[PDB]
Design a protein around this ligand. Structure first.
Ligand SMILES: Nc1nc2c(ncn2[C@@H]2O[C@H](COP(=O)(O)OP(=O)(O)OP(=O)(O)O)[C@@H](O)[C@H]2O)c(=O)[nH]1
Ligand SMILES: Nc1nc2c(ncn2[C@@H]2O[C@H](COP(=O)(O)OP(=O)(O)O)[C@@H](O)[C@H]2O)c(=O)[nH]1
Ligand SMILES: [Mg+2]
Ligand SMILES: [Mg+2]
Lengths: 5, 69, 440, 422, 5
């Protein structure tokens, strides 16, 4: 899954 | 009556003295029993953490064999 | 002569101590810098107020007290507060790390680091006394210092002072302001340990005091400063006989004689009146006859007990202010008629009364109306045992699953110490039952 | 008095950094370390988390640690990077390719001695050190493996101080890494024996909150972290402001942990919008607002801390907190009376006018460990990926021990859930 | 009974 702060 | 008048007052001293005695003792026993029980709980804690330090070497000294082959 | 040394242990003990000594100062005309313009005996004195206050050269009246805590926050506020100048620094004794709501930490781990210093300072006060009566010890049942260190000090004081009287003011835990889930545990332990070292203990139930602040003073959510101000009035009533004197005054030790039939049955029930707001008190003055009646209304009790379902072993009335013998006598006649008030068969039924003409004062910005006359009833009723039962049930539920017991063992205590404390509490409830039974 | 902070690894240093950003704000501490606040309640108990350097500079008593430097330069380059004491940066290079073994035994152990040097520097300074709080993830290798090493190394030097962890549980919905069910079960094996109190931060819950509740089309890590910081400021409010209840780490553990092992907490926050007191109270006891992926109504509450922050009526909080215990009476174990406590802090968190932070030790937390153990035994029944570990010299038994030990913990939660009075 | 000479 594509998750950057 | 005079012999009895002394027996009564020295009985009161003996009992108030003994209250002070028992108390002083019951304290010193349960204060020492406490020191021992805590020192022990701390010792066993430090124990378990120090056998985790020798298991940690048996892992660093297990890999040190595998690498070299 | 007949000096009395107050010992304020832990937060509750200290904060209640603040309220009390502020109030005493307002009652004796003592400024927060210790100076007292009434006292002409400079440097010394024989007066009634000298049992709670020593004097110095400078003209400074100094509380015969010690404030002890295992952590500095609460006593630090005393050191910097309105009445800072009143004490001498050696009297305010602090640790660094508290007892974390742990009896074991208070009695042992942390307490042992400071017990000697406290006794050294207590001793230094005793040396100022021509004839010490004894000690008053203010503490919470629930705190770790309040419970554990108090037991330690009391045991140590039994030893260093033999059988000089030791009275407790013990704050009994209430859920509306409880700080620890384990307060039942701490309660049963200190009560057991202190039982044979305490001559007389006045339990203050916080739920009772929270109830009265809510109901009679219309305080929405009571604070500690609320409870303390009410509690102080009650303590003031009980110590009034020791700090004032007049023809009609009866010494507390006399009340003590009536109140304790056996050395273990030393927990009197306090009931105080009138607790009334300034709004209600305006234009409505309360009579000797009216406040006396309140004493038998359980809403005004200091411990949540029901004396009606229990039997009386004694009744004392500590009047202060505008009270005359004539009116008191008629007042009790009424209640002897209008109530039932069962006594055990082995006790007489007379009420021991004392009167101090010195009227109740109040603290500025207090919530309590400044009344002309007031009264504290001290009763020895079997119903007080209800307090033990509620706490013993709470204790029972947790120890069944040994819940939380591990924070105690880890500090050095045993399961045996628990079961033992609990057996004493069972005996005490049994004892409080045995006395209610009729004779043969 | 003083707490010493330790953040470790990618996740550890991210959530750690945000935690400081946030409470630095609440206490009115700027990125340089000066105070510019209005209220004196701010500096009352500032010493708990900050040292007072020369020139009235407040400095996070915080130690930063990693095996790759990647994350830590991001921090020093961050908004607050300079506030930190530069010496307290302690990062290796050899890294840990999300291998728990590399953090614990092999790659982490050469660096462990240098981290501990920095701890001692901060601990010797403490007027009264109460203990340590740690930030880290349980899916990775540095934070997971070397964090658990560190705890054990610190405990045997500070065995009577409190050990507290904000541990981040791994979920597939957030990391496609395959070995995470191994890393977690291995560190959880350490946590049960060696921490006093452990805040379970569940990513399945942080994602689901963000996607379901916050309608974030695609949630970022910073999105998840904005929840984590809200929680962390929430559960440490009582540690940092002059208060009554749970004012230090020990007094909290004593009120929260009835049995030494069962110390895994289910934190809650409200409002979760990212507003009334009866609404706050209900929300913070609702499944959706839980920061661990559990329905508390699938178990019983052993103990609970509730912290209400903001200007509100304390009579109302009192009546409401009694409301929810009465109505939900069945969900609180009988044999621990008065197991729910309530704090109230005047100072609202930044942005909100009033919040509610929840902290509960529920036997419903067993739901979270069961999910990890299904992900674990599925991969381990086949002995998959075990070369990454045994390679580092480990033993297959140490997996079983970690398996069976973690299974004991769940039983224990079920035991006390099924217990009764008389 | 309250009774002073
Ligand atoms: N009436 C009244 N009760 C108080 C006060 N302060 C604390 N308490 C009660 O005392 C109990 C907690 O014990 P504390 O006195 O606060 O704790 P402590 O004696 O300082 O012991 P530790 O803090 O654990 O070291 C609770 O049940 C409180 O409700 C107070 O100022 N007034
Ligand atoms: N909530 C949150 N979780 C993270 C973050 N970074 C990594 N993780 C989680 O941590 C696990 C991987 O551990 P990681 O921190 O990358 O290991 P490390 O390289 O040793 O520090 C995965 O389950 C991630 O979902 C973050 O910034 N926030
Ligand atoms: Mg305290
Ligand atoms: Mg004089």
């Amino acid at each position: 899954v594509v998750x950057x702060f | 009556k005079r012999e009895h008048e002394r027996e009564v007052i020295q009985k009161a001293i003996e009992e108030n003295n003994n209250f002070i005695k028992m108390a002083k003792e019951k304290l010193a026993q349960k204060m020492e029993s406490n020191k021992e029980n805590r020192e022990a709980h701390l010792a066993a804690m430090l124990e378990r953490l120090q056998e985790k330090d020798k298991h940690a070497e048996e892992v660093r000294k297990n890999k040190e064999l595998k690498e070299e082959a | 002569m007949r000096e009395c040394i107050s010992i304020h242990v832990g937060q509750a003990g200290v904060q209640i101590g603040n309220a009390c000594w502020e109030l005493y100062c307002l009652e004796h005309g003592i400024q927060p810098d210790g100076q007292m313009p009434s006292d002409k005996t400079i440097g010394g004195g024989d007066d009634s107020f000298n049992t709670f206050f020593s004097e110095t050269g400078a003209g400074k009246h100094v509380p015969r007290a010690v404030f002890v805590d295992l952590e500095p926050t609460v006593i630090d506020e005393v050191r910097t507060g309105t009445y800072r100048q009143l004490f001498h620094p050696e009297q305010l004794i602090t640790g660094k790390e508290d007892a974390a709501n742990n009896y074991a930490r208070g009695h042992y781990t942390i307490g042992k680091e400071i017990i000697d210093l406290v006794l050294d300072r207590i001793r230094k006060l005793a040396d100022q006394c021509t004839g010490l009566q004894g000690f008053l010890v203010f503490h919470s049942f629930g705190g770790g210092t309040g419970s554990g260190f108090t037991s330690l000090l009391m045991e140590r004081l039994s030893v260093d002072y033999g059988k000089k009287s030791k009275l407790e003011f013990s704050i009994y835990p209430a859920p509306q302001v409880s700080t620890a889930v384990v307060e039942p545990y701490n309660s049963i332990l200190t009560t057991h340990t202190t039982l044979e070292h305490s001559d007389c203990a006045f339990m203050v139930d916080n739920e009772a005091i929270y109830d009265i602040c809510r109901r009679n003073l219309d305080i929405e959510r009571p604070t500690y400063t609320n409870l303390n101000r009410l509690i102080s009035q009650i303590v003031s009533s009980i110590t009034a006989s020791l700090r004032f004197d007049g023809a009609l005054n009866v010494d507390l030790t006399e009340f003590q004689t009536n109140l304790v039939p056996y050395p273990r049955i030393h927990f009197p029930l306090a009931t105080y009146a009138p607790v009334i707001s300034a709004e209600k008190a305006y234009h409505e003055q309360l009579s000797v006859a009216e406040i006396t009646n309140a004493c038998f209304e359980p809403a005004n009790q200091m411990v949540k007990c029901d004396p009606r379902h229990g039997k009386y072993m004694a009744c004392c009335l500590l009047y202060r202010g505008d009270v005359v013998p004539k009116d008191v006598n008629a007042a009790i006649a009424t209640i002897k008629t209008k109530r039932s008030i069962q006594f055990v068969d082995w006790c007489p039924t007379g009420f021991k009364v004392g009167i101090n003409y010195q009227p109740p004062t109040v603290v500025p910005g207090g919530d309590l109306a400044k009344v002309q006359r007031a009264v504290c009833m001290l009763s020895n009723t079997t119903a007080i045992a209800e307090a033990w039962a509620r706490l013993d049930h709470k204790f029972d539920l947790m120890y069944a699953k040994r819940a939380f017991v591990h924070w105690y063992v880890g500090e050095g205590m045993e399961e045996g110490e628990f079961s033992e404390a609990r057996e004493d509490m069972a005996a005490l409830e049994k004892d409080y039952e045995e006395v209610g039974v009729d004779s043969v | 008095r003083e707490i010493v902070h330790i953040q470790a690894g990618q996740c550890g240093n991210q959530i750690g950094a945000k935690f400081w950003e946030v409470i630095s704000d609440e206490h009115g501490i700027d990125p340089t370390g000066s105070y510019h606040g209005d209220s004196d309640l701010q500096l009352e108990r500032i010493n708990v988390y900050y040292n007072e350097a020369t020139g009235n500079k407040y400095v996070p008593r915080a130690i930063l640690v990693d095996l790759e430097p990647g994350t830590m330069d991001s921090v020093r380059s961050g908004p607050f990077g300079q506030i930190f004491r530069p010496d307290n940066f302690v990062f290796g290079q050899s890294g840990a390719g999300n291998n728990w073994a590399k953090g614990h035994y092999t790659e982490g152990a050469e660096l462990v001695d240098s981290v501990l040097d920095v701890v001692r520097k901060e601990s010797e300074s403490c007027d009264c050190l109460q203990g340590f709080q740690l930030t880290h993830s349980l899916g990775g290798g540095t934070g997971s493996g070397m964090g658990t090493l560190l705890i054990s190394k610190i405990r045997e030097e500070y065995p009577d101080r409190i050990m507290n962890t904000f541990s981040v549980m791994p979920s597939p919905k957030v990391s496609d890494t395959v070995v995470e069910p191994y890393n977690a079960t291995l560190s959880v094996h350490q946590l049960v024996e060696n921490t006093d109190e452990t805040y379970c931060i569940d990513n399945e819950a942080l994602y689901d909150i963000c996607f379901r509740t916050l309608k974030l089309t695609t949630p970022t890590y910073g999105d998840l972290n904005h929840l984590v910081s809200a929680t962390m400021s929430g559960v440490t409010t009582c540690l940092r402001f002059p208060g009554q209840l749970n004012a230090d780490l020990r007094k909290l553990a004593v009120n929260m942990v009835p049995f030494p092992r069962l110390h895994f907490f289910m934190p809650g926050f409200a409002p979760l919008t990212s507003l009334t007191v009866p609404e706050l109270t209900q929300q913070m006891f609702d499944s959706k607002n839980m920061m661990a992926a559990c329905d508390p109504r699938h178990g019983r509450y052993l103990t609970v801390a509730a912290i209400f922050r903001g200007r509100m009526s304390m009579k109302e909080v009192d009546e409401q907190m009694l409301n929810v215990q009465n109505k939900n009476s069945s969900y609180f174990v009988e044999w621990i009376p008065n197991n729910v406590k309530t704090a109230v802090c005047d100072i609202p968190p930044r942005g909100l006018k009033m919040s509610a932070t929840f902290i509960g030790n529920s036997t419903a937390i067993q739901e979270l460990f069961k999910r990890i153990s299904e992900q674990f035994t599925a991969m381990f029944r086949r002995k998959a990926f075990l070369h990454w570990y045994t390679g580092e010299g480990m033993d297959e038994m140490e997996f079983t021990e970690a398996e069976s030990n973690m299974n004991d913990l769940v039983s224990e939660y079920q035991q006390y859930q099924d217990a009764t009075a008389d």
